[PDB]
């Protein structure tokens, strides 16, 4: 991936980190069946006001080395291609070719 | 006094105990007719006994885990055979002839990348 994309991702992450407490609270408020209608409405509107990049469902998991969006693995934080390389080199602990 | 043999076939693992008695079979605290609804299964569990006339002579307590029905039955049979071998040690030849001493090593073949199954290749086309 590009540098720019990576930067964007980072920014998104930062935003998420920032706005988590508020956003979560808002969500809770919206959910809460034992609450006022007007309040709920306000909460809904409030959420809209907050930045979009603040959402965690905005950020894409990219490879930590290359930034490749596809072929990702969570345990390693790496795209398949890089993961394989790591494995070959001995750089991922415990990981070896499996047969059964 | 109770004699014993381990049973194993597919992913089943039977625990057959042989005792002297009248010939009542219990599988996981249930009768042979209750546990195995299938006739074939019943037949397979009775096979070894039929082969060596000790159906009326000995009771057997069984507990089996894993696999399905047929596999389980097979495992049980194997266990029984083992028990018999342990107990008499002069019926071995007959058992061998029958083909019951043999652990049936047929496991399910693993699925292989590329293929839809163990061997089914996906539909090919030149064009």
């Amino acid at each position: 991936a590009k540098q720019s994309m990576k930067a964007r991702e980072v920014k998104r992450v930062a935003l998420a980190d920032k706005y988590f407490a508020k956003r979560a609270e808002l969500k809770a408020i919206i959910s809460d069946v034992n609450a006022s209608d007007e309040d709920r409405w306000n909460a809904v509107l409030k959420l809209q006001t907050l930045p979009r990049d603040s959402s965690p469902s905005r950020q894409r998991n990219r490879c930590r080395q290359t930034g490749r969006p596809h072929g990702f693995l969570r345990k390693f934080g790496l795209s398949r291609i890089k993961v394989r390389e790591a494995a070959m080199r001995g750089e991922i602990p415990g990981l070896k070719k499996a047969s059964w | 006094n109770q004699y014993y043999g381990t049973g194993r076939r597919k992913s089943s693992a039977a625990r057959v105990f042989i005792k002297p008695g009248n010939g009542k079979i219990v599988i996981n605290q249930r009768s042979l007719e209750q546990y195995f609804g299938r006739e074939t299964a019943r037949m397979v569990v009775r096979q070894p006994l039929e082969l060596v006339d000790m159906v009326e002579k000995l009771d057997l307590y069984i507990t089996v885990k894993g696999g399905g029905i047929s596999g389980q039955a097979g495992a049980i049979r194997h266990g029984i055979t083992r028990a018999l071998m342990e107990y008499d040690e002069s019926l071995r030849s007959e058992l061998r002839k029958a083909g019951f001493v043999t652990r049936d090593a047929r496991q399910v073949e693993r699925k292989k990348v590329g293929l839809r199954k163990a061997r089914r290749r996906p539909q090919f086309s030149k064009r």
Binding site: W41, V44, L45 | -
Partner: protein, 83 residues
């Protein structure tokens, strides 16, 4: 469709604009991009030029259009025929 408990959706800005229009009593078309906005009872009578991706297409709101959204009356694709 949207959940009943959440209510109807309208863009805040759009709503504000509508309110302003109502206050005025004017009938100049309001150019809008909020295709996702639901139409409201108070919006009846107003012309509201909804974006279709390319251009703003005028939509005179009617009593029948209320439950619907603005994007329903502003078709995006432009297919005449194959021959």
């Amino acid at each position: 469709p949207r959940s009943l408990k959440k209510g109807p959706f309208i863009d805040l800005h759009l709503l504000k604009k509508v309110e302003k229009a109502v206050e005025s009593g004017d009938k100049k078309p309001l150019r809008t991009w909020s295709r996702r906005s639901t139409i409201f009872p108070n919006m009846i009578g107003l012309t509201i030029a909804v974006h279709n991706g390319r251009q703003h297409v005028p939509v005179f709101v009617t009593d029948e259009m209320v439950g619907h959204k603005l994007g329903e009356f502003a078709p995006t694709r432009t297919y005449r025929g194959h021959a």
